[PDB]
């Protein structure tokens, strides 16, 4: 018979990192989680309790609840033709603050700051991110750089 | 150089490998008691061996650890029996040494036919001061190279006092 236990196919997913087995460092237990925090889910197979099912490995979601030893996390999950709402009880050992949100908050703090120093000058801001643009015209010089000119190479076995 | 590190007998452990359980083994222990002044400890068989006739977790052998001036005294009594000569064997690379005697009455000790006659092993282990470094709970550590006991060293020790002979090689 086929075999579809709970931790199937997770031989390498829940392995520890090479030369990173053993006690989980204290940092992990000192990070504080509030509701509305966006957490990254990544199981640690030494902490067997509060484990995320293998689906949620690699998935980010928001804390809806905070408890003695675990956060509750909301995950949107597609089944069939629609996302369903999913509530996960994960111990903190399997959870991490999502850096991408910190890029965002820090940018929001930037964009309020930029906006001030412009009304304090009544000038214009230009606050939206622009994407990487073409390139403007340049004049490269030949001073100390007369173009070495290359040509294709003969065939030659080295074995 | 040579101040601290004066090199001494850490402990002496006498063994009688009786090899069977019951009266013979209670009797062998009593000897070790009647000698060490200590209450000795029984050893259990690590595994069943049929040609020797021992079963797993059977009480087979008894030993007692002696330290301090007593063990220095029971060492001599033995040394006395081996006529103050040992072999360049006996001395382990790590600095400890040992020997064995047949017949325990040969070092003091009345006879007492309700106790009979046992022989016994004599392993004495050597250290210096500063060995608690390897033994304590907190900040356990390893001795330094230019410290710590060896066989060259604790053979010459053995000759210097005891006025002894170590034989062969």
């Amino acid at each position: 018979g086929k075999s579809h236990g709970y931790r199937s196919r997770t031989r390498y997913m829940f392995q520890r990192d090479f030369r990173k087995h053993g006690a989980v460092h204290l940092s992990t237990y000192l990070k504080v989680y509030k509701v509305g925090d966006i957490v990254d889910i990544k199981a640690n197979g030494s902490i067997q309790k509060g484990m995320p099912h293998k689906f949620y490995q690699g998935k980010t979601g928001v804390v809806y609840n905070v408890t003695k030893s675990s956060v509750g996390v909301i995950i949107n999950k597609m089944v069939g033709n629609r996302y369903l709402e999913k509530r996960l009880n994960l111990r903190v050992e399997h959870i991490k603050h999502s850096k991408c949100r910190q890029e965002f908050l820090e940018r929001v703090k930037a964009n309020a700051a930029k906006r001030a120093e412009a009304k304090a000058q009544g000038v214009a801001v230009q606050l939206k991110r622009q994407p990487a643009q073409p390139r403007e015209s340049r004049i490269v010089s030949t001073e100390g750089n007369v173009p070495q000119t290359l040509a294709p190479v003969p065939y030659e076995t080295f074995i | 150089q040579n101040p601290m590190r004066d090199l001494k007998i850490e402990k002496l452990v006498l063994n009688i490998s009786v090899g069977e359980s019951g009266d013979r083994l209670t009797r062998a222990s009593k000897v070790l008691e009647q000698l060490s002044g200590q209450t000795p400890v029984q050893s259990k068989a690590r595994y069943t061996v049929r040609t020797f006739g021992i079963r797993r977790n059977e009480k087979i052998a008894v030993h007692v650890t002696v330290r301090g001036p007593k063990a220095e005294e029971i060492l001599e009594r033995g040394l006395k029996v081996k006529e103050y000569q040992l072999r360049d064997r006996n001395f382990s690379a790590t600095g400890n040494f040992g020997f064995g005697i047949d017949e325990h009455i040969d070092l003091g000790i009345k006879y007492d036919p309700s106790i009979g006659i046992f022989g016994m092993d004599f392993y004495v282990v050597m250290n210096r001061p500063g060995a608690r470094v390897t033994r304590r709970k907190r900040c356990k550590g390893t001795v330094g190279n230019s410290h710590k006991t060896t066989k060259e060293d604790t053979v010459s020790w053995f000759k210097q006092k005891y006025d002894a002979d170590v034989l062969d090689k």
């Binding site: 809806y64 609840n65 905070v66 408890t67 509750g72 949107n76 597609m78 069939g80 033709n81 629609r82 996302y83 369903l84 709402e85 509530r87 | -």
Partner: protein, 58 residues
Amino acid sequence: AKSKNHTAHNQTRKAHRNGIKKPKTYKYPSLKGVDPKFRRNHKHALHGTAKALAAAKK
């Protein structure tokens, strides 16, 4: 007689006719499975913070 056993062929086509959407979204979302004591106290912090506002109308 033997027949085909399984396939996901055509299934994402089917799922994507009028499907995927997103998940439905609300401020004041469900409080399903939140710490019961906290809810209990939240209950009270609300009644109070209500009250106090009607007191500020006379």
